[PDB]
A paper describes a structure:
Laccases are four-copper oxidases that catalyze the oxidation of phenolic units in lignin as well as a wide range of phenolic compounds and aromatic amines. Because of their oxidoreductase activity, laccases can react with 2,2′-azino-bis(3-ethylbenzothiazoline-6-sulphonic acid) (ABTS) as a substrate and as a mediator for studying laccase-mediator systems. In addition, our previously discovered Cerrena sp. RSD1 laccase, DLac, had the highest organic-solvent enhancement and tolerance among the fungal laccases tested. We found that pre-incubation of fungal laccases with certain organic solvents significantly increased their activity toward both phenolic and non-phenolic substrates.
We also crystalized acetone-pre-incubated DLac to investigate whether the protein was modified or bonded by acetone molecules. DLac after 1-day acetone-pre-incubation was prepared for crystallization. At the crystallization stage, the crystal-growth time was 2, 9 and 20 days with pre-incubated acetone concentration 30%, 20% and 0%, respectively, which suggests that acetone may accelerate DLac crystallization. However, this tetragonal crystal structure showed neither binding of the acetone molecule nor any chemical modification. Thus, this immediately reversible enhancement was due to neither chemical modification nor covalent binding with solvent molecules.
Author numbering: 2 to 495
The structure:
Amino acid sequence: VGPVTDIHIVNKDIAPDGFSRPSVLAGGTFPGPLITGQKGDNFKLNVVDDLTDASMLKSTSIHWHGFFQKGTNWADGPAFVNQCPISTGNSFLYNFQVPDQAGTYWYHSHLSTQYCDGLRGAFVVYDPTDPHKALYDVDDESTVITLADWYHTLARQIVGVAIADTTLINGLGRNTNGPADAALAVINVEAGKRYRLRLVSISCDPNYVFSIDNHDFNIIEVDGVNSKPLNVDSIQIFAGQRYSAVLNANQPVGNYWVRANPNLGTTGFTGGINSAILRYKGAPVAEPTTTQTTSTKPLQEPNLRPLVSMPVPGSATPGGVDVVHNLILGFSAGKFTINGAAFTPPSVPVLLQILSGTTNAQDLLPSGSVITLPIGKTIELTLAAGVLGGPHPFHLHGHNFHVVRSAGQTTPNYVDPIVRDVVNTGGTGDNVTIRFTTDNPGPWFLHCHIDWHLEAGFAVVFAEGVNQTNAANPTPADWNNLCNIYNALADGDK
Ligand SMILES: *[C@@H]1O[C@H](CO)[C@@H](O[C@@H]2O[C@H](CO)[C@@H](O)[C@H](O)[C@H]2NC(C)=O)[C@H](O)[C@H]1NC(C)=O
Ligand SMILES: *[C@@H]1O[C@H](CO)[C@@H](O)[C@H](O)[C@H]1NC(C)=O
Ligand SMILES: [Cu+2]
Ligand SMILES: [Cu+2]
Ligand SMILES: [Cu+2]
Ligand SMILES: [Cu+2]
């Protein structure tokens, strides 16, 4: 569907691994419908909130992950940063353009932990003059592969640490204690053809080590950014990351296991959990018998290079930028913290605070969780790891960033590091460093993409170009009324 479409947000009981539970779904499916368009399109995505189950929230808001939203900050999605939520029985039109981006993206609820309850799907923007197009034969709905964590317990009823119950690949998977006749996803190929696999993590938490028995890949895209082709045989993919990986169907006609091994919950592949099937045309309709061969060329982020020269902003030394924030990532008193502050949402969305006249840095709410950035400047952030519950994949809205230092990398790369929008911060001893330029007025979230951690405070808002935000982001009438509608709701109807 798309670029112009209604998207109904509904409650439905579903059982993707055989266990039935209530859910919040775009288009009544898990994952939601694939949204598509072409580079340069105007997306007009009319989100119709038909939710009735208070246990997963009747309100909603959708984030279109990876899009810059230049001049449409109001459409970015995060509840109480960029909008008040959409209220049940109402619609809201996300109306934005994608002039300068093409690649593999996704969308998800950005209200509390609601995307874990099912509101997530893939979003692909095709490039009619894609520089990589001659490297593959097939690129369509059938080559999108979503990796999802699935919980038997509703997000708002979770007790203690959330642990995914089942891995779902294209919405299908087996649970370790579930029916073994539960359907496995099948990726269909024909011998001799080449496939652009668009691998999308729609995870609320775990990372996945992705592989296909007896096959390898050339990575050609990273979080929307074209890369030099990189030959790999396994891909660790963190929450919200995307890769395009070209697969050549060059093995004998048969069935081959597709493997997505999570870092938490039940790991491995006993009984066909954490698995899907690559089936060549002409093979029996049956489960694979193939063996996981050792990974001789796993993806390492420092090996990724942009296809086109993307010069690193600033100078080639630590702190060689206009603005440095060495962010202190911590945990105390039951909450995650950035520079000592746990994010909790304000009653007035940050964008509305600014648009209504609050332009002094000290007055923006929540106090301690908003950092103003001046417009037209080079920025360096460090995200030194060690804090519990990792590895934490950090995400910056409104921007891509250069990963000048990856997890596990000591010496920064100021020449040709990859540019992306979700980065693994790693563990103790890592000091992930990212750079970008402030070219996009408005408030933009920076947070851990483990949704449980965002809920527990692991976020900060960058109010970029506060005094340019009003001129840059004219708002539509329906956005202007969201807070009035939402604040009028009874507490049981939120
Ligand atoms: C992560 O790297 C940054 C450099 O990019 C370190 O920042 C320096 O920290 C020291 C000690 O606090 C300061 O005296 C320097 O002024 C900082 N340099 C810059 C350029 O800002 C940071 O300490 C590193 N973090 C960890 C945990 O190793
Ligand atoms: C915006 O401009 C006003 C008026 O000059 C000033 O008081 C304020 O500090 C500016 N805000 C930021 C975040 O630069
Ligand atoms: Cu996201
Ligand atoms: Cu995002
Ligand atoms: Cu986290
Ligand atoms: Cu976000």
